[PDB]
Ligand binder design. Structure first.
Ligand SMILES: [N]S(=O)(=O)[C][C][C][C][C]C1234B567B89%10B%11%12%13B85%14B%1158B%12%11%15B%139%12B%1061B%12%112C5%153B%14874
Ligand SMILES: [Zn+2]
Length: 257
């Protein structure tokens, strides 16, 4: 039932998911001058060389690329994290125009899109158990700005016509998510939530400072996706982002000065 429209969007979600008004909701605005440099924060360890992508899917809210998470093949460690987090999937949030689309904001600036690489803590054994824990998930967030093309995104772009409408999926093997990463792993981190229902308060957020650039042609292909199922009235999948939520009693920490 939930979505991004006037009658089912973010301002409505609290009715089905009352944690929407909780103490550690995401996304947030990252006020760069208030974030605390923490010299105790470790470099982030991103180990994606053995990643196994499986499928690409239009789930009615975004599209996602899903990975084999039955072994420690594509893992996030270090940074603010204790233990090992397996990559489950990545997906994006984006706008109808280039001035909106990101979930996190930086000094109130909105980026054209935001990439989320979703990982879960292997100490809980499966993702469903992990979402019930305050340290169950780690989501790596990467901003997208529009300029030059990102070559490592093109394989994704080119198959989106095959998953236009909700419920559609395709094979998507041998995709290397290292081609989506910026040069720097400098980051901000804070305790938060899933940004879609069920909005569980289970996420250590790690938001990279450096955006990636994608081309206008690449993001325009995102905007040709449909929220609707095949044959239903066509509603472009655009503006699938939750706005910034109150920071409440939280500190955003920076890995860099
Ligand atoms: N924008 S975000 O990365 O915060 C939310 C992405 C959803 C994370 C993965 C889940 B799948 B299964 B259940 B469904 B719902 B619960 B469980 B796994 B997590 C989320 B969805
Ligand atoms: Zn997301």
């Amino acid at each position: 039932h939930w979505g991004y429209g006037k009658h089912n969007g973010p301002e409505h979600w609290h009715k089905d998911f009352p944690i929407a008004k909780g103490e550690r909701q995401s996304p947030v605005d990252i006020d760069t001058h208030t974030a605390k440099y923490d010299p105790s924060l470790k470099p982030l360890s991103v180990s994606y060389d053995q990643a196994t992508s499986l499928r690409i899917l239009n789930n009615g809210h975004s599209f996602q690329v899903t990975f084999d998470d039955s072994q420690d093949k594509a893992v996030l460690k270090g940074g603010p994290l204790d233990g090992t987090y397996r990559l489950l999937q990545f997906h994006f949030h984006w706008g109808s125009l280039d001035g909106q689309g990101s979930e996190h904001t930086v000094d109130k600036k909105k980026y054209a899109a935001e990439l989320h690489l979703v990982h879960w803590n292997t100490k809980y054994g499966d993702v469903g158990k992990a979402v019930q824990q305050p340290d169950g998930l780690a989501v790596l967030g990467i901003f997208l700005k529009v300029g030059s093309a990102k070559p490592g995104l093109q394989k994704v772009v080119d198959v989106l016509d095959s998953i236009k409408t909700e419920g559609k999926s395709a094979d998507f093997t041998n995709f290397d998510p290292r081609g989506l990463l910026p040069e720097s792993l400098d980051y901000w981190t804070y305790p938060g939530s899933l940004t879609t229902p069920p909005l569980a308060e289970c996420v250590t957020w790690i938001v990279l400072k450096e955006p990636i650039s994608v081309s206008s042609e690449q993001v325009l292909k995102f905007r040709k996706l449909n929220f609707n199922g095949e044959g239903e009235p066509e509603e472009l999948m655009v503006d699938n982002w939750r706005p910034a939520q109150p920071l409440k009693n939280r500190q955003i920490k920076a890995s860099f000065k």
